[PDB]
Scaffold this active site. Structure first.
Site, mmCIF file in Angstrom:
data_model
loop_
_atom_site.group_PDB
_atom_site.id
_atom_site.type_symbol
_atom_site.label_atom_id
_atom_site.label_comp_id
_atom_site.label_asym_id
_atom_site.label_seq_id
_atom_site.Cartn_x
_atom_site.Cartn_y
_atom_site.Cartn_z
ATOM 1 N N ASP B 253 0.355 -0.974 0.138
ATOM 2 C CA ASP B 253 0.000 0.010 0.174
ATOM 3 C C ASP B 253 0.683 1.010 -0.273
ATOM 4 O O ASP B 253 1.938 1.198 0.323
ATOM 5 C CB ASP B 253 -0.914 -0.181 1.270
ATOM 6 C CG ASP B 253 -1.919 1.197 1.408
ATOM 7 O OD1 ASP B 253 -2.452 1.638 0.015
ATOM 8 O OD2 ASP B 253 -2.089 1.129 2.340
ATOM 9 N N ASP B 256 2.969 5.257 -3.779
ATOM 10 C CA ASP B 256 2.584 6.194 -4.474
ATOM 11 C C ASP B 256 2.504 7.822 -4.101
ATOM 12 O O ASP B 256 3.635 8.609 -4.490
ATOM 13 C CB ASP B 256 1.384 6.275 -5.310
ATOM 14 C CG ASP B 256 -0.137 5.832 -4.659
ATOM 15 O OD1 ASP B 256 0.186 6.255 -2.861
ATOM 16 O OD2 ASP B 256 -1.521 5.731 -4.716
ATOM 17 N N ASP B 315 -8.802 3.696 -3.670
ATOM 18 C CA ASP B 315 -9.999 3.644 -2.460
ATOM 19 C C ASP B 315 -10.736 4.021 -3.218
ATOM 20 O O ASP B 315 -11.393 5.361 -2.666
ATOM 21 C CB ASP B 315 -9.792 5.108 -1.120
ATOM 22 C CG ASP B 315 -8.620 3.933 -0.892
ATOM 23 O OD1 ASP B 315 -8.332 3.126 -0.237
ATOM 24 O OD2 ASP B 315 -7.278 4.707 0.179
HETATM 25 C C1 LIG Z 1 -8.350 5.418 4.464
HETATM 26 C C2 LIG Z 1 -7.097 6.106 3.589
HETATM 27 O O1 LIG Z 1 -7.252 7.416 4.707
HETATM 28 C C3 LIG Z 1 -6.032 8.162 3.552
HETATM 29 O O2 LIG Z 1 -7.228 8.982 2.674
HETATM 30 C C4 LIG Z 1 -7.935 9.139 2.264
HETATM 31 C C5 LIG Z 1 -8.404 10.294 3.870
HETATM 32 O O3 LIG Z 1 -8.314 9.988 4.475
HETATM 33 C C6 LIG Z 1 -10.177 11.015 3.017
HETATM 34 O O4 LIG Z 1 -10.706 12.112 4.331
HETATM 35 C C7 LIG Z 1 -11.282 10.585 2.390
HETATM 36 O O5 LIG Z 1 -10.333 11.888 1.301
HETATM 37 C C8 LIG Z 1 -11.136 12.878 0.399
HETATM 38 C C9 LIG Z 1 -12.001 13.371 0.946
HETATM 39 O O6 LIG Z 1 -12.207 12.949 2.685
HETATM 40 C C10 LIG Z 1 -13.037 14.333 1.080
HETATM 41 O O7 LIG Z 1 -14.056 15.402 0.923
HETATM 42 C C11 LIG Z 1 -13.057 14.684 -1.344
HETATM 43 O O8 LIG Z 1 -11.813 16.089 -0.746
HETATM 44 O O9 LIG Z 1 -11.511 14.006 -1.197
HETATM 45 C C12 LIG Z 1 -10.407 13.203 -0.899
HETATM 46 C C13 LIG Z 1 -10.055 12.578 -1.743
HETATM 47 O O10 LIG Z 1 -9.059 13.289 -2.009
HETATM 48 O O11 LIG Z 1 -10.465 9.764 1.251
HETATM 49 C C14 LIG Z 1 -9.438 9.388 1.272
HETATM 50 C C15 LIG Z 1 -9.197 8.386 0.401
HETATM 51 O O12 LIG Z 1 -8.783 6.893 0.968
HETATM 52 C C16 LIG Z 1 -4.296 7.600 3.050
HETATM 53 O O13 LIG Z 1 -4.580 8.245 1.603
HETATM 54 C C17 LIG Z 1 -5.394 6.309 2.309
HETATM 55 O O14 LIG Z 1 -4.154 5.872 1.683
HETATM 56 C C18 LIG Z 1 -6.208 5.714 3.161
HETATM 57 N N1 LIG Z 1 -6.313 4.362 2.468
HETATM 58 C C19 LIG Z 1 -5.007 3.115 2.105
HETATM 59 C C20 LIG Z 1 -5.072 2.555 3.441
HETATM 60 C C21 LIG Z 1 -5.765 1.138 4.291
HETATM 61 C C22 LIG Z 1 -5.442 0.915 6.197
HETATM 62 O O15 LIG Z 1 -4.357 0.522 5.663
HETATM 63 C C23 LIG Z 1 -6.603 0.485 3.481
HETATM 64 O O16 LIG Z 1 -7.232 -0.685 3.474
HETATM 65 C C24 LIG Z 1 -6.731 1.106 1.949
HETATM 66 O O17 LIG Z 1 -6.495 -0.190 1.066
HETATM 67 C C25 LIG Z 1 -5.159 2.185 1.286
HETATM 68 O O18 LIG Z 1 -5.849 2.209 -0.075
#
Ligand SMILES: C[C@H]1O[C@H](O[C@H]2[C@H](O)[C@@H](O)[C@@H](O[C@H]3[C@H](O)[C@@H](O)[C@@H](O)O[C@@H]3CO)O[C@@H]2CO)[C@H](O)[C@@H](O)[C@@H]1N[C@H]1C=C(CO)[C@@H](O)[C@H](O)[C@H]1O
Ligand SMILES: C[C@H]1O[C@H](O[C@H]2[C@H](O)[C@@H](O)[C@@H](O[C@H]3[C@H](O)[C@@H](O)[C@@H](O)O[C@@H]3CO)O[C@@H]2CO)[C@H](O)[C@@H](O)[C@@H]1N[C@H]1C=C(CO)[C@@H](O)[C@H](O)[C@H]1O
Ligand SMILES: OC[C@H]1O[C@H](O[C@H]2[C@H](O)[C@@H](O)[C@@H](O)O[C@@H]2CO)[C@H](O)[C@@H](O)[C@@H]1O
Ligand SMILES: [Ca+2]
Ligand SMILES: [Ca+2]
Ligand SMILES: [Ca+2]
Ligand SMILES: [Mg+2]
Ligand SMILES: [Mg+2]
Ligand SMILES: [Mg+2]
Ligand SMILES: [Mg+2]
Ligand SMILES: [Mg+2]
Ligand SMILES: [Mg+2]
Ligand SMILES: [Mg+2]
Ligand SMILES: [Mg+2]
Ligand SMILES: [Mg+2]
Ligand code: NI
Ligand code: NI
Lengths: 1247, 474
Positions: B253, B256, B315
């Site tokens: 994960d 990038d 995501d």
């Molecule tokens: C869990 C996820 O967290 C991080 O990215 C997320 C943000 O924390 C969220 O707040 C959301 O961002 C969006 C805003 O809420 C929205 O208002 C808009 O401005 O768009 C934003 C997105 O551009 O969503 C984000 C994306 O999900 C972090 O960067 C991300 O890498 C995290 N996901 C990985 C982590 C885990 C936990 O280990 C895995 O389960 C997932 O498969 C991963 O891909």
């Protein structure tokens, strides 16, 4: 942006064709074509025939093709490569490639305008061809289709499920692949098909290529893709189970896993794998926690048992990995994985540490607008209040900012949240405990519920954009404070030290300079508090001795002003006005106050203007109508003007503070906390104006709401300067609170009376303040202080009737010294129960006692002595030494170790002596500390009675860098051996000048000595201009072609009593072009100043590190330098300097040797000299760590540095110099991880 | 940060955030003030002499006190007289405890031993101090039974009773505690809290504020560089133990981009390949080619395929399509276009989070509807890497979505698993030509204009064309 030149040579050989192209130079371009397969061509363009750069990892390092046997015909124009599947034509004039099928169909070609070049490839093709590749779309993007017919998106890996690369191909029968690290593919519907290396893309570029390596594929899409995989690599086979269904999951443990697998198997729903998120690992923990199984969540992962049991149920396990390590454990300790990664250079380049979060929680906002909501909030708060939460830090009552949650609280949220706690705590305690709260917004009304306001998450920087641009810093804060005041919320504070940094919580603490200045500032604001980010520390001792001592100092001033301040807290309950206000409140018609924020009023009678500038040598301070008296320096200024105010940039001891004439300022001894003891004597400083002024002194319990129903005490104090007397009225007591105050001691400045009267009675006269204090019942006395003549008048407080005192006549003291009794001074030590003490158990002392228990290491006493100008002050210490032999104690001035005092036996503990030492004091407040510093070799073990500080120095000094500069004169550190924190250069243009404000006690002729540099080779001239009078010429010789040499220019000047201006200007006939450093002034011949003994350059490492010093360094050949200079503020907690802002360090992750040296020619050969330094060592014991003296005529002298963690003083005395010079040095030999800090190095001439 | 003058002002009157202050209060040193009673609104000034105030439209912050009348106040006098009159109308300030004129140390990251040592450090130096303020450290924020009101006795053992209060009072220290105007509605173990049930049943949540996932324990981290061989050797070496004990697939994960507070750092285009290369080289050496490597990453650049990695689509949103529930992530309908775009770049080993990752409100937000879940499993079963995933403490087992979702999922899984030997040949094919289990129709039909942008159906192996139902109520 230009195409290839003509072919000048073609050399065929097997499947390769090599072309030499004309570029108009002896180094021709090369173009190597290789036929790899029947349908795959390699092309490598090497401008100027230079060797190709290595291929990026796009390319399979192991790729290999069978021999194709292609037909290459170099006979004609064009040159012609054929296979059964393709035909490649290269025209000769200029070189241009056309690619075709075997059957002659044109697929693509380089246009006339230009094909391949130094920075990419450029083709043209059928405009209706459909193009594919380049890019995909991520989980944050609009999702297009497959067509790329009008594309300019970069080729990148991207993020969030993106894919991309330098791969553009068509269903019309061709494909193009470029070896590149990022880049910019381009297509349009005119038929263009291009790729440009371009500038560094957002993702960075770590593989650069001087050549252009490309591949041309021919065929149907399947054949194109097969060829792409010959070049870039085929996919190894995944395990068969990978074709099965997988359940990825975040939020899971071994029991849940087992239930989930049972659920699938019970229902014959196939499944081959579960993937485990954070749950699986000990992410966050030391010892590679982010690689090891979390056995709380998965106990049977202690062994192979979990693996094998899931194998038996047909489940393979997948585990999430983040390409990062935790550098700090949950306990804030550096992790083993950090050390391994840092030492071997394994961090991603350009990626610093940063603060992440990883345990989620679900929250939802409460509504404070509802009464029943408020009751409930309070009721669940009661238990916390009984167990000691007595103030409420009401955070985030304004806006939620968290992912998809962007929610606003309404304008009354802060008021209503505050009401909850206020109505609540008031009901529960029956109006018996006063409410304190803070919030980070204010709207009108909210003040009814007893809330302050703080300025939020401000930046740890001097100003917005110093370090980063997304938060303001220190300099903006007065504007916030004063704007809050104009909104009726004067109860304001800020996070002194700042909250935010680059990189979040792991980002730097404030520099010692920024911290010191910010504390000085916040001590004169209403809610005085430090704060910082997670695991950041804000205790003043962590920022080194200047910050500790200066902070302590300004804190003593604030706490001494408790009774002054508290009267303003009372006022806020009657009119809403509080402790601060902007000048425009008092000067509504002054256009210079209209927008003024660099100074403000602290109560009614003090104007404060903190030094907020980095490396600031002087302040421009607007003083509105009236007469102002410098609080620390004593001089008066008339209002209605902007003044030039020198500050000592070296000591940081100045807080520019001015008393408004009319001031009546109650004050008191310094307490450690507000109700530490009863205060029965209140001092009242009065600076009378010709109009009546007044101040209503006020007491109450400080705790309850009893004051609301009359349970308080007030007394109106009022004063007026009359024709030949001062009249002061102490009005009658008023209210029911029995105040602790028993006596006022009035300090009536501006007159030393011969009589003090009251109600037909002349008060009894005592010989001095001391004798007055010790008397019961009323009296008077007179004296001198920093302000001039003073009359002391001791009176009963809280009489039932008014008392009117009148001081008449003028009988000035002839005292030459102020006396500070050290038992009234600040007592300290290493721990709270080993502080120095007060005692009376030997006879003969002055005042109320003396100071004992200077007999445990680190015990000390600290006096705050004001001086009117900088210079030499012989300060007398009265002490007793009945130990049988001489004892040592350090004298520290403004956090610099000035001398070890050798204090002789006095015969007995009840027999007293005097030692007088010449102290380098600065204008305004000085910090004089007598300390048992066992780490400097002191013994301690004496008792101290008082010190005597003369009102006037033997000789005065004025820093050039702090003078009024004009006409291009500026300040600089770009040459060596200046005194103080800088010098003045750029005296080059006519009109350039430095203008000193020099004080004299009486009209007369005074000696001047001006320290200047002239490395022009020849004599140069300025003019001297005293009090605007006639220019005299100043003729300044040159030592030679050398700006690191300083001489004295000696002269006399006729001066008037009080303030004088003395300027050194380049007038039109003068030549200019010299550097000025300091003006010394005396009635006698001028000698070496106590501030200027240090013969080293940059001995304190305070110089801005952009500029060099006479220090040199050494390491063994091929080793990186282990030596630097900085503040230690990046570290958590800070490893700060010994004094001021900076310290040298030695450090390396790996084994190392390192030294620094400085050589100086001494002023007097064949005599004695002395090396002193502060040194601190930590972590791994080195083989060698020492101060070194050598080159002096004798053999090397060494002093070892002892691993501890604490600042120690190393001293090498009796340096007998016969060579005319001395090399002083520090050297470390380490096996690795030894940190040495070096500070405050002084080489002096030795008694 | 501007000045004090408000001579050309259109900024609204609000409490604001982050240290801001405001209100419908406009006054001059020329001798007058204007105070209007309002909940937000729009003061206006300009240098032609206008001094105006408008209620206007509903502010950013909302408006809960609307008014039909207009209630205002005119003050006359010098600045202090105007301010006293302001305090007559809006209120004087109660007196604070006297200790609040002292110095206060606020701190985040503090326990009882550290507090005691700080206080000792002040007193030993005769540096005055009246108060410590404690951040989250003081409380059991995150737990059940009103943990966000309760002393944290793991950090402050003696706050079990009045002892801490009393020993600190004896040392001249008052305690301040941080408060947040919210409650935790799901404890660390995903259980609804007492405080949740109490506020929900009494109506105590702020209107218009739904629950939301916040984060609260900070950690310090730093990115590793997989571009260096000796770094990869090290990364592998430290993974061996986790592998022996059962982690046989590497879900790599965040190779990038860092998007975290002030930290906004990119990894380079070869980061995925090289991270993959660390595990590939390593596992192969260590098992002497006896155990096949499997990995997944959320980005692809050419050459990365050599190191045994699939690609997942990140995501993505729990929704039928971009904009159905929210605009900031795509949904299910877009995913074919992404998969087939990856195929066109030579990465056909592609998957997606079936069910979606993101919903409104974060992890606390809605799971896929049974319909969405069911249609997405059907689609998933005909893609190469077939996987459900969801957000923190979200569940993706098919039986939770009711019996149609259970049974239709089972059914399509049975179809997939019966096609094992058909599928596995394409796995073999990707080892020889790089072509895999899916491809768009334009591979077989390069001149068909109806196939040129077509992504609603695709080929699963050579001999099956699938077009899953992805419309709601279709
Ligand atoms: C869990 C996820 O967290 C991080 O990215 C997320 C943000 O924390 C969220 O707040 C959301 O961002 C969006 C805003 O809420 C929205 O208002 C808009 O401005 O768009 C934003 C997105 O551009 O969503 C984000 C994306 O999900 C972090 O960067 C991300 O890498 C995290 N996901 C990985 C982590 C885990 C936990 O280990 C895995 O389960 C997932 O498969 C991963 O891909
Ligand atoms: C801890 C603090 O967090 C929240 O706000 C901060 C962000 O988390 C930070 O990432 C940072 O955001 C900035 C970006 O880094 C920057 O690139 C730029 O885009 O500007 C962003 C902000 O304008 O800084 C944010 C502000 O600090 C949260 O919203 C905030 O309320 C939090 N501060 C409170 C929390 C605690 C801990 O209980 C207290 O110690 C503080 O006193 C509170 O004010
Ligand atoms: O679109 C082709 C274009 O590529 C190059 O410009 C880059 C530039 O270097 C980058 O810094 C970034 O802004 O993207 C640009 C392309 O979008 C070439 O210098 C230019 O001549 C060419 O037309
Ligand atoms: Ca004494
Ligand atoms: Ca100087
Ligand atoms: Ca220093
Ligand atoms: Mg070949
Ligand atoms: Mg078209
Ligand atoms: Mg180039
Ligand atoms: Mg779960
Ligand atoms: Mg079982
Ligand atoms: Mg463990
Ligand atoms: Mg801490
Ligand atoms: Mg203790
Ligand atoms: Mg607990
Ligand atoms: Ni992209
Ligand atoms: Ni605002």
């Amino acid at each position: 942006m230009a195409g290839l030149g003509n072919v000048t040579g073609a050399v065929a050989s097997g499947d390769s064709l090599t072309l030499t192209l004309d570029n108009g130079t002896s180094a021709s371009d090369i173009l190597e074509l290789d036929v790899l397969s029947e349908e795959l061509l390699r092309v490598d363009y090497r401008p100027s025939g230079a060797a190709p750069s290595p291929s990026t990892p796009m390319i399979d390092p192991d790729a290999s093709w069978d021999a194709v046997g292609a037909t290459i015909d170099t006979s004609g124009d064009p040159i012609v490569v054929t296979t059964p599947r393709m035909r490649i034509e290269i025209a000769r004039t200029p070189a241009r490639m056309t690619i075709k099928k075997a059957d002659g169909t044109t697929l693509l070609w380089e246009p006339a305008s230009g094909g391949v070049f130094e920075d990419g490839v450029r083709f043209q093709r059928g405009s209706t061809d459909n193009i594919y590749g380049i890019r995909s779309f991520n989980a944050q993007e609009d999702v297009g289709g497959l067509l790329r017919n009008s594309s300019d998106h970069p080729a990148h890996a991207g993020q969030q499920g993106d894919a991309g690369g330098p791969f553009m191909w068509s269903t019309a029968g061709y494909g193009v692949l470029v070896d590149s690290d990022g880049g910019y593919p381009y297509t349009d519907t005119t038929g263009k098909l291009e790729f440009y290396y371009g500038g560094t893309p957002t993702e960075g570029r770590r593989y650069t290529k001087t050549n252009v390596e490309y591949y041309i594929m021919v065929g149907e899409p399947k054949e194109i893709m097969a060829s792409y995989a010959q070049v870039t690599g085929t996919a190894p086979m995944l395990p068969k189970w990978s074709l099965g269904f997988m359940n990825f999951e975040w939020g899971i443990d071994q029991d849940e896993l087992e239930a989930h697998v049972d659920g699938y198997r019970a229902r014959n729903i196939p499944i081959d794998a579960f993937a485990l998120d954070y749950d699986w690992m000990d992410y966050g923990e030391d010892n590679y926690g982010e690689f090891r199984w979390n056995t709380d969540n998965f106990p049977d992962a202690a062994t192979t048992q979990l693996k094998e049991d899931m194998e038996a149920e047909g489940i393979r396990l997948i585990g999430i990995r983040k390409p990062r390590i935790i550098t700090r454990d949950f306990a804030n300790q550096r992790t083993q994985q950090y050390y391994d990664a840092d030492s071997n250079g394994y961090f991603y380049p350009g990626h610093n540490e940063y603060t992440d979060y990883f345990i989620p929680v679900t929250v939802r906002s409460f509504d404070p607008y509802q009464q029943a909501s408020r009751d409930w909030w309070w009721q669940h708060s009661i238990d916390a209040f009984d167990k000691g939460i007595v103030g409420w830090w009401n955070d985030e009552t304004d806006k939620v900012d968290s992912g998809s949650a962007q929610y606003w609280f309404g304008n009354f949220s802060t008021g209503f949240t505050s009401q909850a706690m206020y109505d609540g705590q008031r009901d529960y305690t029956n109006d018996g405990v006063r409410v304190w709260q803070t919030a980070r917004s204010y709207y009108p009304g909210a003040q009814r519920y007893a809330t302050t306001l703080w300025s939020g998450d401000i930046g740890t920087q001097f100003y917005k954009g110093e370090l980063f641009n997304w938060a303001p810093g220190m300099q903006e804060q007065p504007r916030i404070m004063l704007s809050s005041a104009n909104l009726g919320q004067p109860k304001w504070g800020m996070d002194t030290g700042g909250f935010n940094s680059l990189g979040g919580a792991s980002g730097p603490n404030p520099s010692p300079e920024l911290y010191t200045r910010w504390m000085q500032f916040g001590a004169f604001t209403p809610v005085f508090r430090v704060h910082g980010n997670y695991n950041q520390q804000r205790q003043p001792w962590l920022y080194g001795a200047t910050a500790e001592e200066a902070s302590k100092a300004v804190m003593h001033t604030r706490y001494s002003l408790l009774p002054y301040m508290y009267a303003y807290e009372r006022e806020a309950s009657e009119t809403g006005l509080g402790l601060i206000k902007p000048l425009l409140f008092d000067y509504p018609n002054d256009p210079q106050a209209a927008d003024y924020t660099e100074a403000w009023m602290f109560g009614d009678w003090l104007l404060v203007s903190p030094v907020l500038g980095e490396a600031q040598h002087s302040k421009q301070i607007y003083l509105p109508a009236g007469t102002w008296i410098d609080y620390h320096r004593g001089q008066t200024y008339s209002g209605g003007q902007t003044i030039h105010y020198p500050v000592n940039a070296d000591t940081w001891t100045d807080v520019p503070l001015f008393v408004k004439q009319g001031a009546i300022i109650p004050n008191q001894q310094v307490l450690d906390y507000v109700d530490q003891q009863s205060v029965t004597t209140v001092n009242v400083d009065i600076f009378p104006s010709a109009s009546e002024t007044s101040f209503t002194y006020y007491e109450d319990d400080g705790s309850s709401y009893d004051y609301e129903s009359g349970s308080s005490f007030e007394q109106r104090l009022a004063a007026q300067d009359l024709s030949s007397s001062v009249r002061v009225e102490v009005g009658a007591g008023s209210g029911s609170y029995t105040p602790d105050v028993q006596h006022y001691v009035l300090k009536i400045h501006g007159r030393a009376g011969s009589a003090v009267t009251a109600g037909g009675s002349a008060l009894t006269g005592y010989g001095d303040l001391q004798a007055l204090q010790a008397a019961s019942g009323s009296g008077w006395a007179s004296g001198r202080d920093i302000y001039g003549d003073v009359t002391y008048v001791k009176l009963p407080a809280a009489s039932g009737s008014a008392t009117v005192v009148e001081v008449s006549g003028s009988a000035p003291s002839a005292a030459t010294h102020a006396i500070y009794e050290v038992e009234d001074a600040s007592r300290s030590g290493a721990t709270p129960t080993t502080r120095a003490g007060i005692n009376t158990n030997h006879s003969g002392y002055s005042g109320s006692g003396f100071v004992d228990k200077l007999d445990v290491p680190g015990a000390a006493v600290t006096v705050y002595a004001n001086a009117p100008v900088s210079g030499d002050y012989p300060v007398e210490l009265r002490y007793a030494n009945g130990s049988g032999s001489a004892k040592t104690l350090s004298v520290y001035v403004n956090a610099a170790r000035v001398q070890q005092l050798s204090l002789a036996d006095t015969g007995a503990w009840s027999q007293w002596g005097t030692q007088t030492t010449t102290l380098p004091l600065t204008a305004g407040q000085n910090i004089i500390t007598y300390k048992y510093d066992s780490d400097a070799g002191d013994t301690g073990g004496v008792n101290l009675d008082y010190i005597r500080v003369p009102f006037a120095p033997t000789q005065a000094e004025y820093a050039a860098e702090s003078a009024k500069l004009w006409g291009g004169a500026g300040t600089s550190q770009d040459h060596w051996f200046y005194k103080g924190a800088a010098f003045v250069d750029n005296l080059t243009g006519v009109g350039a000048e430095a203008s000193f404000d020099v004080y004299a006690p009486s009209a007369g002729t005074y000696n001047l000595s001006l320290r200047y540099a002239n490395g022009t080779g020849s004599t140069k001239t300025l003019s001297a201009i005293v009090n605007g009078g006639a220019a005299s010429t100043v003729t300044l010789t040159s030592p030679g072609m050398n700006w690191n040499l300083w001489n004295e220019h000696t002269m006399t000047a006729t001066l008037t009593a009080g303030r004088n201006t003395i300027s050194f200007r380049r007038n039109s006939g003068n030549s200019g072009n010299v550097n000025l450093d300091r003006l010394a002034v005396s009635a006698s011949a001028i000698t070496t100043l106590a501030s200027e003994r240090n013969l080293l350059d940059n001995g304190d490492f305070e110089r801005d590190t952009t500029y060099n010093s006479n220090w040199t360094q050494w390491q063994p050949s091929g080793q990186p330098s282990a030596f630097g200079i900085d503040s230690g503020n990046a570290l958590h907690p800070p490893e700060g300097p010994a004094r001021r802002n900076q310290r040298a360090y030695f450090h390396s992750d790996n084994a190392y040797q390192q030294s620094i040296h400085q050589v100086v020619d001494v002023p007097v050969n064949n005599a004695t000299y002395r090396l002193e330094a502060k040194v601190r060592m930590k972590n791994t014991t080195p083989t060698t760590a020492r101060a070194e003296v050598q080159g002096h005529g004798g053999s090397p002298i060494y002093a070892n540095i002892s691993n501890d963690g604490v600042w120690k003083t190393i001293v090498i005395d009796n340096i007998n110099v016969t060579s005319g010079s001395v090399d002083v040095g520090f050297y470390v030999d380490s096996p690795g991880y030894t940190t040495l800090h070096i500070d405050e190095v002084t080489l002096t001439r030795a008694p």
